[PDB]
Amino acid sequence: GTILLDLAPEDKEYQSVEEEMQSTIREHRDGGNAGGIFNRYNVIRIQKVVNKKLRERFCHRQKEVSEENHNHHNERMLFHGSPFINAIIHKGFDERHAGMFGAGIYFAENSSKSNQYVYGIGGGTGCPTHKDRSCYICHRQMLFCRVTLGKSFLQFSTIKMAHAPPGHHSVIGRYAEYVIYRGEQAYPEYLITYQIMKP
Ligand SMILES: CN(C)CC(=O)Nc1ccc2[nH]c(=O)c3ccccc3c2c1
Numbered sequence: 110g111t112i113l114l115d116l117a118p119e120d121k122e123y124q125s126v127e128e129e130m131q132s133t134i135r136e137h138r139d140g141g142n143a144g145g146i147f148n149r150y151n152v153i154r155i156q157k158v159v160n161k162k163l164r165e166r167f168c169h170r171q172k173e174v175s176e177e178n179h180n181h182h183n184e185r186m187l188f189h190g191s192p193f194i195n196a197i198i199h200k201g202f203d204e205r206h207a208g209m210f211g212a213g214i215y216f217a218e219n220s221s222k223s224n225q226y227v228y229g230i231g232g233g234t235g236c237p238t239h240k241d242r243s244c245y246i247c248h249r250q251m252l253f254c255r256v257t258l259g260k261s262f263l264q265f266s267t268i269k270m271a272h273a274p275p276g277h278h279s280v281i282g283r284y285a286e287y288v289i290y291r292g293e294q295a296y297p298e299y300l301i302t303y304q305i306m307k308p
């Protein structure tokens with residue numbers, strides 16, 4: 110089963126994660142409709158997900174991807190926002206639940222892009238209690254994941270792909286969207302509990 114390790118704010122790891130989250134907020138085309146209006150987050154807690162089965166699957170896939178990618182994982186730390194975080198942290202990512210670049214699991218370099226998906230597509234109906242996509246009260250959660258990109262395929266138009274192209278392990282689609290077609294190519298490393306803050 111999954112254990113959550115609670116990172117202390119004094120930890121360098123907690124600070125590194127928070128700074129990656131704080132420095133990657135950007136203005137979105139929808140003017141904050143999906144994710145809300147804010148310039149910074151209030152990080153409530155940062156937890157590390159430890160699950161032996163999930164780590165074994167991620168490690169097993171990494172090795173396979175490595176052989177087909179000049180002995181490189183091409184691992185990147187990326188954000189993922191989802192209303193299904195609880196399922197992700199206990200069962201791992203599952204592509205069977207999966208778009209612009211087809212049936213994959215999507216990751217972003219910008220935490221504010223992942224924040225737009227925390228309550229669903231287009232931010233859904235926002236938070237459960239206030240039905241507010243820009244809620245400053247309710248605690249949100251997002252993941253900061255280890256993603257095995259391997260040999261990325263660069264896509265520049267919308268395409269409904271089922272799997273990465275032959276000899277490739279991921280799609281970087283065009284801001285860039287990082288897409289994997291196998292759940293075992295991402296590990297939900299950090300679970301971030303936060304609030305968006307009113308400017
Ligand atoms: C068919 N689409 C309406 C489904 C969809 O977009 N699902 C989905 C669901 C969750 C998503 N989470 C993210 O963090 C993200 C980051 C960059 C780009 C997309 C996502 C993302 C996308």
Ligand SMILES: CN(C)CC(=O)Nc1ccc2[nH]c(=O)c3ccccc3c2c1
Pocket residue numbers: 193196197201202203204206207213214215292
């Ligand atoms: C009935 N459904 C609305 C429930 C559902 O979709 N649950 C669910 C449950 C687990 C999920 N796990 C994922 O890795 C994932 C990745 C991209 C998009 C969705 C998921 C995901 C979704």
Ligand SMILES: [Zn+2]
Pocket residue numbers: 236237238239240241244245246247
């Ligand atoms: Zn709320």
